[PDB]
Design a protein around this ligand. Sequence first.
Ligand code: WZL
Ligand code: WZL
Ligand code: WZL
Ligand code: WZL
Ligand code: WZL
Ligand code: WZL
Lengths: 217, 217, 217, 217, 217, 217
Amino acid sequence: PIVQNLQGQMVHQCISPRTLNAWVKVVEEKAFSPEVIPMFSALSCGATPQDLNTMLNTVGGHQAAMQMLKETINEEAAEWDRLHPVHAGPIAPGQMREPRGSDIAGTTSTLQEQIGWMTHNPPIPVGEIYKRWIILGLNKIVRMYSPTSILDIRQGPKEPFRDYVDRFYKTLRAEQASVKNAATETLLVQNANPDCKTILKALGPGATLEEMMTACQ
Amino acid sequence: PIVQNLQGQMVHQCISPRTLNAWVKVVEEKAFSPEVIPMFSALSCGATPQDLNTMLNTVGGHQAAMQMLKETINEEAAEWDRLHPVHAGPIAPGQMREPRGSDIAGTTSTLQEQIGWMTHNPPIPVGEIYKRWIILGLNKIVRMYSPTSILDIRQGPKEPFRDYVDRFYKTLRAEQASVKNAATETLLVQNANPDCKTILKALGPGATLEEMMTACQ
Amino acid sequence: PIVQNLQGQMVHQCISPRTLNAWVKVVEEKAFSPEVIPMFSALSCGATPQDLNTMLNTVGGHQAAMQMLKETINEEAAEWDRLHPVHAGPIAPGQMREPRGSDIAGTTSTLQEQIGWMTHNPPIPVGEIYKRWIILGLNKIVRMYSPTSILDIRQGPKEPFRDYVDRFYKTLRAEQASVKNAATETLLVQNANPDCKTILKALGPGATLEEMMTACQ
Amino acid sequence: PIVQNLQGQMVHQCISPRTLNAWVKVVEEKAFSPEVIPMFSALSCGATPQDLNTMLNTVGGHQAAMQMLKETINEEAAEWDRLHPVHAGPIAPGQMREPRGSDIAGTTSTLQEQIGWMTHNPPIPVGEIYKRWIILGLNKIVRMYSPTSILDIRQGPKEPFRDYVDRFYKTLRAEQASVKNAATETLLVQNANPDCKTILKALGPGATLEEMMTACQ
Amino acid sequence: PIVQNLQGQMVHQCISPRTLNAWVKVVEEKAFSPEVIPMFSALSCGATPQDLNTMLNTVGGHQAAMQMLKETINEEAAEWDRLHPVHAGPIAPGQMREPRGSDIAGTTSTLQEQIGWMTHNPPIPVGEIYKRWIILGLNKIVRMYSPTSILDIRQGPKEPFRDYVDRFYKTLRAEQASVKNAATETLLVQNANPDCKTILKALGPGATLEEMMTACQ
Amino acid sequence: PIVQNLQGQMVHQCISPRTLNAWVKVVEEKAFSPEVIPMFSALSCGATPQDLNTMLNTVGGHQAAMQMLKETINEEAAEWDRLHPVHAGPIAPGQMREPRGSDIAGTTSTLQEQIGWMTHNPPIPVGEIYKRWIILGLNKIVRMYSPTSILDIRQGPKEPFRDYVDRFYKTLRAEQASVKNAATETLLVQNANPDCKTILKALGPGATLEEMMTACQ
Ligand SMILES: O=c1[nH]c2c(Br)cccc2n1Cc1ccccc1
Ligand SMILES: O=c1[nH]c2c(Br)cccc2n1Cc1ccccc1
Ligand SMILES: O=c1[nH]c2c(Br)cccc2n1Cc1ccccc1
Ligand SMILES: O=c1[nH]c2c(Br)cccc2n1Cc1ccccc1
Ligand SMILES: O=c1[nH]c2c(Br)cccc2n1Cc1ccccc1
Ligand SMILES: O=c1[nH]c2c(Br)cccc2n1Cc1ccccc1
């Protein structure tokens, strides 16, 4: 990554073994549960494109997902190039060249180039632009791999309301409803069991989740 | 987080993998036992709003609680805005803008903005203001998820007084009696078993817990 | 804690995850065995009052003990205030105020105040004063939770002398005899089994523990 | 490795125990699965030739592979020497000598020499040149140890399409098809089971993997 | 401990959790096997007397040994005082006082005093003087707790010579023969089994251990 | 060890707990498999003689080997003294004395002396000279403890060629053939099973290992 040292300058630091292992193990344990995305983002704090590729490339399973992610990346890289075309032919000697989509994705740019963009004044934050693309991809995968429709999360007749709500919002998070506060006074009540539904209906509209959860305790 | 380096300046540091993992595992092991709150506070030492959101967002279960927490956050953000409205329209070029509730919660502010507030002279401690909101939320959840009323913590006929007292104060902590020294010379004696109650009554009022615990040994 | 950096100034550092976890796990594994106290002291090296409270507050069990400890703290805080009363009414603008008992215990003082006391010239070592109070409390708990009287530690007829001595001094440590060198040429011999007692009596007085242990091998 | 310190100069740092252990354990757990290569590259960030040899030499099993890797190294070293022959006889006193193939591979050069090349202006990046050779070798091994031909990865009649695709791209990665986006609209469909193949044929050409995977859900 | 920082000055650093845990666990796993002593010495690198006491005091078992160690310490402290008596009565204001035995053992000296001695020019290395005393004590314990006389380490009729030699030198190390090279051409041969003894006798005198071990393979 | 800090000067640093534990555990897990030697070398990066002795002395088993290693050390120390005799009698006040064999092995020199040699201009690299001696010793032990002659590594009739080759080069590494590329087109083919031998003979001479391994797949 690029870090500030103990004296203020932005400099390159090797990716730690700790970071490398943390990311690999989160994917091993959680696959594409939605909580993997914020973890990915945090573990990739300060990352260069190189570092991003390293993290992705260290994943051994899930190669259908990694291939889908390459595809998303390629789509975002092609839109980058449409928005910001680069002058072809030879670069002014010693000068910074402008990044293309593939340079941002770290496939046709060197670490040194990446460091130059990222630390230039003003900076071209290639690592953050690429991260956004990867996260866009990752979110598609989380949605695709969501195993259950929100329509099938219904409270069991003996199921504690809290366990139902946990299932419902974990499902909603994966399906990626933006709806989130919203769905509360509608689908969540509809999919509640008969006894709880009666209670919740009686509360009247505008009930907070806390209120709903106390009511159905 | 924002830290002081080895030379005195306040600067941004990536959240560690160690920190990230510690928080995720505490929630996995302890759920919303009350001791999770001081741990959260300590693990979030120096946090920006971004860092706070990261920590929250890395939690995979308990999505009923995380949704209740968003709600509390939204309530505190709306009261922030009532207390400190911000001039609308365009900001003076290059100048610091004033934070709104959603900026404090990290949803409409950038890391750079956050860093500027937090390190400005005088500082606007957005990370500490947000932390207070999250802790307010978290405390509601701890109370809600407390499984037993203090009224049901009564000493077993064969139950060591110390184990009873441990149960009683662990329950009181979750229910969040402010009462804490208080409840000592009342409910704790009332809920003691017949033999211990007799002993404790004989001690007279004003007995310290230590005295009570020795007496009922 | 407050640490010296790599350039000589005293500055605040966040409590580490490593420290936090170490303390929680020692309490989980060892409860109030006497060796927990020196560990607590060492893990709290450089601690502010805030840090002390964090460590205490992260303990999830043993709430009878934590309540007894609050009580001891309150007693020491009240004696602090008797010894060092503070001028009431408004503080000189910008100046350091004097700490009261509750400020030392971190309940009515801010981190910033604490840092100011601890790094002032001359310093008011609030973290060390509070630590002393907590250790006084903790020692009471270790004594209370000692499961066996020294009077009941007697050598088994088939019990190796070394295992007996280990039991005897582990018990004495918990009961907190100051006696420690002392009890050696008396109770330790008295509570030895018949064969070893005969041997030890023959050695004559003034025998070192090493001498006793060789003799009864 | 060679790192930049907290003040800007490039200096030698001992390889960490953490790094050493991470590499040894990845090889123990994953052998020559293709994801070991990006891990190797990342763990060897900043490595000198010495460090590269250390990492390789710490591997205890797989000595057929390590011998094949020496062979590849020797081939690349011999081509280095063909491209960049070095003046024989005695070196100018105090001056940097030019590296030969074996110097780049760390077998006839000292750490000090290596440090001098790597930090000279302009640098001779011996550690990166050697790393490229090792990775060339390693890729040959990954291909050789790939257990299954892509021709034998065919979807089971009851096999979820996603699990098939995972098998297919994991196999392709090992066999090292450059084809990767390519093989998607051909072999992947051909090797799909009858029901999925029918669905995929109906989609028409140009289907993205995401589209294919949704279709065969 | 007292360390040199990244700028050359000697300063106090808190004992790490890592160090604390390492020492406690070595004692738990190995008790007073002789290899614990060099580990103790290395873990206590740079230690103040305070730090030494911390490490000792964190040990929960083995209290017979810890008491024997206090005794040794007291003996060395009393000889210190015989060799280096200190002027009684009040110290020159602001000046360094001279350490007594108990100051060196950290029982009547403050951390600040200890730091002053250790970093004075010229230094009074109180931490190293105390460490020597503790190691003297520890060595007595290792010898006392050695379970087997060297006289009882004899090669089994089916026992590989190498396993015998391992037993013999592990025993000798505990009993603390200075003899070590020595005992090689005598007791080690005497205690060898009949077939190996014959072989070894034939080698003639002056055989190296390597030679002996090859011979009896 | 002696390290360069964050400002360029060579200074002493305590051996880490991490390093100490890593070395002890490698010996526990792998004994004297040949891969222990490069690990030892890497873990001892920057070591003083003191540090080298620490690492060796922390090993609890294998005392036959540790004794053989002392012997090798003594032999190298005696040859050092033959090559570089030192002027006897008193040293010039304040000046660096010249190291003898035993000073290099850390038995008659202080840490301070060692630091002075190692950081003098020009340096006397006592830690690297001693390391070379220890590695010479260690290599003798690896060879001695090799359990199988290369002559007995022959491919099983049902044994995959790759597993045979792994056995053969792991054995050769321990026996310490310099032969290594060499033995490839001879003994390795000779010790192959009948079917593979026929295949390999047909390839003709000059086959690379890769070629051999593909052929016998
Ligand atoms: O090097 C890698 N490995 C990647 C993985 Br694994 C998943 C996603 C993108 C990756 N990239 C960059 C890249 C390559 C080819 C097409 C597009 C993006
Ligand atoms: O980004 C996140 N994730 C959060 C979680 Br998980 C729980 C609480 C608040 C969170 N925030 C900020 C936020 C979002 C939306 C409404 C209010 C607060
Ligand atoms: O915040 C905390 N948590 C504590 C725990 Br847990 C045990 C002892 C004291 C504690 N304190 C300070 C404090 C509070 C109230 C009365 C006195 C002392
Ligand atoms: O020292 C080592 N150990 C190595 C391992 Br293990 C595998 C590959 C190369 C290695 N090298 C460098 C080297 C030696 C001899 C021929 C060519 C390359
Ligand atoms: O504070 C401690 N704990 C010790 C342990 Br545990 C063993 C040895 C000495 C120790 N010391 C110093 C000390 C105390 C009293 C007599 C002599 C030495
Ligand atoms: O202090 C130690 N412990 C050692 C171990 Br354990 C093995 C090898 C040498 C060692 N040394 C140095 C040394 C001592 C005596 C003879 C020669 C070498």
